[PDB]
């Protein structure tokens with residue numbers, strides 16, 4: 001019974017219409033062929049599959065370098081007084097970020113120190129809080145970092161948590177923190193809100209202290225049109241829907257306006273639903289690919305369900321001119337969205353290079369709808385993580401994918417190894433308009449790599465940005481927890497190969513499918 005638009009694409013695909021089932025015909029007849037972008041540039045079903053295939057090929061342009069496992073240590077500053085138990089413990093440290101210049105993104109020099117903010121917590125506990133660390137500016141030793149303690153103090157609980165964001169210097173050399181306030185009092189849901197506070201520090205004989213936290217307030221927690229609200233999520237969640245309102249990255253443009261680029265899901269502008277399975281725009285391949293993808297999605301309940309709930313977004317908003325008490329001045333449509341394709345894209349980050357804006361983000365591909373693609377990544381590598389990336393001619397402008405699909409970095413070792421990494425976060429490099437330093441955390445949380453193997457700071461490595469919108473991983477590598485690249489920072493001892501990327505025993509260890517599935 002095909003209608004004529006469907007007829008059209010079946011023929012172009014080289015498909016014999018007489019081979020189609022009633023259900024296949026009915027599905028193709030529902031297909032909406034509109035070409036209008038409703039929610040920014042999309043990671044299409046085809047882009048995602050291409051990202052996965054690239055990860056599977058283990059292409060040298062994009063793979064995370066191998067790290068020499070034997071060199072890897074827990075960060076000494078991650079042994080510290082815990083925010084919740086008030087007792088000194090060895091903590092997992094994961095998502096971390098330096099205090100940056102709000103304009104250039106460079107690691108800031110604060111009175112001769114570098115400053116970092118980090119999520120830490122006790123392995124295997126629900127313990128999500130942020131801590132302030134310092135080292136001498138340009139110092140290259142993991143072990144020279146010191147932990148000031150939890151920004152929001154001791155006697156904390158799981159009822160009110162802090163998740164990731166960003167941080168910059170204010171005019172008076174106070175720090176403006178952007179973070180995620182999480183309230184779990186409504187039946188332990190992770191009700192996430194973008195929050196901000198001003199930090200006042202003191203410097204005394206090589207000792208940095210947190211003197212005061214001021215102006216702590218909620219900036220934004222979603223509107224309902226551009227970005228999903230908690231109430232919206234709660235109204236329809238029977239357990240298949242993610243909730244995301246986090247990882248706010250602050251950045252100031254040439255004209256002096258501050259923006260937040262952040263992780264969320266779309267709202268009613270272009271909302272999740274079964275209807276997204278029937279939006280042609282979302283597929284992004286040729287006719288054969290799109291149709292094959294439609295039929296695959298409808299024939300597997302897990303893929304159909306995931307596609308029905310997928311609507312990750314990278315959002316943007318403009319702030320007012322009050323440095324110390326930022327409030328939303330304007331909301332916009334997402335820079336990127338992934339309706340039908342993924343329900344999690346994290347740590348969005350913008351780096352200004354030359355006259356361009358590069359938008360990066362990390363994602364676990366097993367948050368995607370295409371089970372085949374991410375399962376195959378799991379079989380190839382033992383993990384499914386990636387950094388993706390896009391470029392625009394202006395901060396709010398239209399972002400276009402790098403390396404065709406958006407792929408930039410792909411997982412290279414199993415999620416349960418010591419040298420596994422996640423939360424790729426690129427930092428500019430002084431004097432270079434075509435390189436960023438890629439930082440990440442190493443060793444997945446909660447002891448999945450073994451007793452005493454805490455999440456720690458990875459060795460960092462350079463990534464080259466080419467003028468034709470491609471990227472190239474470079475073999476240049478630092479010590480663990482280096483935020484600042486210079487000639488002095490390279491350490492060849494950290495470089496691994498497939499063999500030395502594993503500690504003894506680790507090659508022969510089963511996968512942890514609870515973690516990567």
Ligand SMILES: [Ca+2]
Pocket residue numbers: 241242265272309310311312343
């Ligand atoms: Ca969703």
Ligand SMILES: [Ca+2]
Pocket residue numbers: 138139140478482483484485486489
């Ligand atoms: Ca360095």
